[PDB]
Amino acid sequence: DNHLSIVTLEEAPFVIVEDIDPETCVRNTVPCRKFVKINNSTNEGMNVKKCCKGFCIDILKKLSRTVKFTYDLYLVTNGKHGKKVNNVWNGMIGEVVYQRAVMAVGSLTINEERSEVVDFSVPFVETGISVMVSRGTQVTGLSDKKFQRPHDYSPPFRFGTVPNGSTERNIRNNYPYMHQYMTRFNQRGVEDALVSLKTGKLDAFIYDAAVLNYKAGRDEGCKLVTIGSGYIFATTGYGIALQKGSPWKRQIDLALLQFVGDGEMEELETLWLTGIC
Amino acid sequence: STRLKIVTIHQEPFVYVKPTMSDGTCVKKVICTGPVPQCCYGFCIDLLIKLARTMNFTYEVHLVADGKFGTQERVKEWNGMMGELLSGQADMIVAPLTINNERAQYIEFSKPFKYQGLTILVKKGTRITGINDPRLRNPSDKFIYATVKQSSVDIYFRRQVELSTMYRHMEKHNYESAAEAIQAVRDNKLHAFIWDSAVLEFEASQKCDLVTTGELFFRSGFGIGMRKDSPWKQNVSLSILKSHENGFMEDLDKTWV
Numbered sequence: 001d002n003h004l005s006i007v008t009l010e011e012a013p014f015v016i017v018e019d020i021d022p023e024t025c026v027r028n029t030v031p032c033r034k035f036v037k038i039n040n041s042t043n044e045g046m047n048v049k050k051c052c053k054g055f056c057i058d059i060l061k062k063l064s065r066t067v068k069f070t071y072d073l074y075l076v077t078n079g080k081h082g083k084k085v086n087n088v089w090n091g092m093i094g095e096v097v098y099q100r101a102v103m104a105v106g107s108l109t110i111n112e113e114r115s116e117v118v119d120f121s122v123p124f125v126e127t128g129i130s131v132m133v134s135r136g137t138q139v140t141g142l143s144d145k146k147f148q149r150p151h152d153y154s155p156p157f158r159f160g161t162v163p164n165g166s167t168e169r170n171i172r173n174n175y176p177y178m179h180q181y182m183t184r185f186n187q188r189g190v191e192d193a194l195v196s197l198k199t200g201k202l203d204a205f206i207y208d209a210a211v212l213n214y215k216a217g218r219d220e221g222c223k224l225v226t227i228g229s230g231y232i233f234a235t236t237g238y239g240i241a242l243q244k245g246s247p248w249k250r251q252i253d254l255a256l257l258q259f260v261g262d263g264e265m266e267e268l269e270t271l272w273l274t275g276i277c
Numbered sequence: 278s279t280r281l282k283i284v285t286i287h288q289e290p291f292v293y294v295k296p297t298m299s300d301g302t303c304v305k306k307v308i309c310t311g312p313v314p315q316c317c318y319g320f321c322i323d324l325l326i327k328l329a330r331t332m333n334f335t336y337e338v339h340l341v342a343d344g345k346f347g348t349q350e351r352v353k354e355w356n357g358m359m360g361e362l363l364s365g366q367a368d369m370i371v372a373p374l375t376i377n378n379e380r381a382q383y384i385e386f387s388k389p390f391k392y393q394g395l396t397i398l399v400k401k402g403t404r405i406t407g408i409n410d411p412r413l414r415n416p417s418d419k420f421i422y423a424t425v426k427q428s429s430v431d432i433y434f435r436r437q438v439e440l441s442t443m444y445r446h447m448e449k450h451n452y453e454s455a456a457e458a459i460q461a462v463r464d465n466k467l468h469a470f471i472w473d474s475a476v477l478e479f480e481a482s483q484k485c486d487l488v489t490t491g492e493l494f495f496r497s498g499f500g501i502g503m504r505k506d507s508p509w510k511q512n513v514s515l516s517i518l519k520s521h522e523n524g525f526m527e528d529l530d531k532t533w534v
């Protein structure tokens with residue numbers, strides 16, 4: 001039990017996956033496998049061996065040293081971060097719920113409905129829900145009327161999100177009319193949403209605050225901005241999702257809290273989230 | 278089977294402290310016993326009241342005796358609110374208590390109900406670049422800066438040997454409470470106050486003679502204080518997480534902060 005099964009999900013700059021040397025994972029990368037199907041009828045597949053790096057990856061390494069545990073790393077393939085579908089959890093959350101991963105590492109937002117099924121560590125990356133535009137807006141935020149009641153304009157505002165995450169889960173519970181309006185503007189990923197913003201097809205992109213602040217700081221020409229100059233709704237953070245009652249809950253937080261007072265979270269903050277804009 | 282004993286500390290805008298009227302009574306106000314029945318209200322009090330129904334429990338608020346947050350000093354014992362929670366005088370710390378490593382080793386923090394950080398408060402007209410200003414890095418008794426005694430900021434400057442000198446100049450100038458240090462900056466004998474931004478910049482928004490500088494040089498958060506065995510931890514954290522999502526913590530931030 002000194003060796004743990006750990007699940008992760010790719011989302012720059014926290015978890016970045018690159019193809020391996022056609023032999024080992026070099027530099028600051030850690031070996032991480034990904035179950036890839038053979039075809040779309042058989043359940044048969046193969047674990048392709050890749051290399052993972054980023055903010056949450058080094059966080060895993062620092063905790064791997066201080067807490068003294070070995071691990072294998074694997075990318076989630078049934079979903080992404082996690083969503084309760086027909087009272088069944090998928091994604092990284094589902095991997096911990098059904099005892100296929102001892103802990104989950106990555107840009108895993110801590111919300112209330114997940115803490116009912118898993119145990120979250122201390123938030124080590126502040127995040128939430130922010131709005132990204134490009135550019136020239138006077139909207140206050142999500143509580144701005146234009147998101148609340150879109151059709152009170154002719155034309156209404158065209159804003160969307162990437163579904164099945166903690167962001168869409170929050171807007172559905174809080175704003176029923178806004179949520180059913182955003183469904184036509186749902187983006188398949190963060191890269192598609194940025195393209196839609198700069199091409200004029202999308203007016204605003206509602207997503208995780210930490211990722212938006214990262215993408216806004218690395219924009220060519222400093223055109224993507226988060227409104228409020230960085231305002232965040234439903235403030236929370238990324239957290240290591242563990243089993244409910246996990247005996248590893250006692251050091252991960254104490255060692256993460258150590259990383260804060262030590263001055264090591266600052267390094268990875270200036271290592272991976274240093275912004276040009 | 279018993280009322281929960283709530284320990285709080287005077288720290289506006291989170292917790293105000295006012296005296297009872299001649300009738301013995303006092304927005305949502307709760308009678309708090311402090312060094313004497315007093316009146317307490319604010320951010321942390323509304324949050325305590327919101328916790329008390331979500332969980333359906335009765336409580337009694339009383340201020341901390343020594344008037345401190347809590348640090349571990351050698352005779353090792355905890356002072357401030359930390360000691361009262363560990364000794365049994367308290368069952369729950371509802372206050373702007375900073376979550377750090379040393380405190381979490383003994384008590385159980387809930388998920389943070391307030392995300393913020395550390396900044397520097399100065400008298401408007403005094404210019405320092407930030408925490409890395411030469412008047413703070415290489416200090417002199419010409420420029421006086423300090424923090425609050427027996428606080429989390431005091432722990433932050435002493436647990437790193439590189440910050441050993443920034444700490445020693447403060448070691449002689451630290452104050453017993455934040456309120457004394459803030460007005461001391463107005464009287465121009467405290468030149469800089471290093472404290473949490475949730476308190477400093479808010480008071481800079483009400484007293485237009487002080488200004489916060491350098492923005493945040495270190496991030497920290499506020500969590501509910503509980504012992505290792507409090508059977509409310511699971512539900513306190515869930516209530517805080519739910520309070521963050523439903524835009525309700527945001528209501529308190531506009532109401533008080």
Ligand SMILES: Cc1ncc(CNC(=O)c2cnc(CNS(=O)(=O)c3ccc(F)c(Cl)c3)cn2)s1
Pocket residue numbers: 122123124125126127210237257260265266269376377389392393496497498499500
């Ligand atoms: C975008 C980024 N945010 C944070 C990064 C690096 N880590 C921290 O600053 C940090 C600081 N303190 C703690 C523990 N206390 S806490 O109250 O739980 C808390 C306070 C403020 C925070 F911001 C977060 Cl996340 C959590 C954890 N983490 S990088």
Ligand SMILES: N[C@@H](CCC(=O)O)C(=O)O
Pocket residue numbers: 081082107108109110162164165166167168207208209
């Ligand atoms: N970080 C989110 C995914 C992105 C989002 O929904 O904003 C989660 O863990 O669910």
